[PDB]
Design a protein around this ligand. Structure first.
Ligand SMILES: CCn1cnc2c1c(=O)[nH]c(=O)n2CC1CCC(CNS(=O)(=O)c2ccc(OC3CCOCC3)c(F)c2)CC1
Length: 126
């Protein structure tokens, strides 16, 4: 099958801004990205190349760390809640598509545990 176009990372009609919490790029994203389990989550799923049939019939809100990184770099998010939701969509997609206890699920759970540790230390708005 064909892959869908990836999620937008910038939009000329959506207001842009930078906040000190959007920490999410320099601390949270970077800490997850360097983890040895991060690589399957760093780019959109290519369903044919990864042999994942049926993926985009099941997952209609795909999300990956590469998209989140680029959204942050482009000032796409207005607030931390929008960015956190994308991380959580990424984890949830993995838990929905794959079977419980699969290696990829255990990898996502380890990244999610680390994510929550970093979110716990999200700074107050300046
Ligand atoms: C997220 C989108 N996405 C991308 N690829 C996807 C998916 C998707 O949604 N489902 C998919 O199936 N795939 C294909 C996969 C399936 C599996 C996979 C792991 N291979 S691995 O990095 O060599 C590896 C690592 C850790 C291991 O064990 C530890 C032991 C302690 O707990 C944690 C697990 C281990 F045994 C093997 C890599 C791609």
């Amino acid at each position: 099958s064909m892959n869908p176009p990836p999620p937008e990372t910038s939009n000329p009609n959506k207001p842009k801004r930078q906040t000190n919490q959007l920490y999410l790029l320099r601390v949270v994203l970077k800490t997850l990205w360097k983890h040895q389990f991060a690589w399957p989550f760093q780019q959109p799923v290519d369903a044919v190349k990864l042999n994942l049939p049926d993926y985009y019939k099941i997952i209609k809100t795909p999300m990956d760390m590469g998209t989140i990184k680029k959204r942050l770099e482009n000032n796409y998010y207005w607030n931390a809640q929008e960015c956190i939701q994308d991380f959580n969509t990424m984890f949830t997609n993995c838990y929905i598509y794959n079977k419980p206890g699969d290696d990829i699920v255990l990898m996502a759970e380890a990244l999610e545990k680390l994510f929550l540790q970093k979110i716990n230390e999200l700074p107050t708005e300046e």
